Amino acid sequence: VYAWNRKRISNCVADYSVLYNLAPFFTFKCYGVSPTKLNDLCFTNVYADS
């Protein structure tokens, strides 16, 4: 928690609907954007944290 890994998703077409179908991935609701169609809409500079 005190030292997050630095990694980002770039030039990818990674599907997020397979994650939604997966039972472990239980949080998919989105406050300001589309909850289920997040992957379909285009975006840039996605950063990841652990």
Partner: protein, 50 residues
């Protein structure tokens, strides 16, 4: 939390389609049956009266 509000619904609603009967979100093979489990939300939360 006497002033309940429906933050989550099935999808977007047309005008005059107000939320009267509470139908919680279903995102699995089994319908939400009496449990506020993961990916299943209830409108029962404080309305920020503090």
């Amino acid at each position: 939390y006497n002033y309940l509000y429906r933050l989550f619904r099935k999808s977007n609603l047309k005008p005059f389609e107000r939320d009267i009967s509470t139908e919680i979100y279903q995102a699995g093979n089994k319908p939400c049956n009496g449990v506020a489990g993961f990916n299943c939300y209830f409108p029962l939360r404080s309305y920020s009266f503090r």
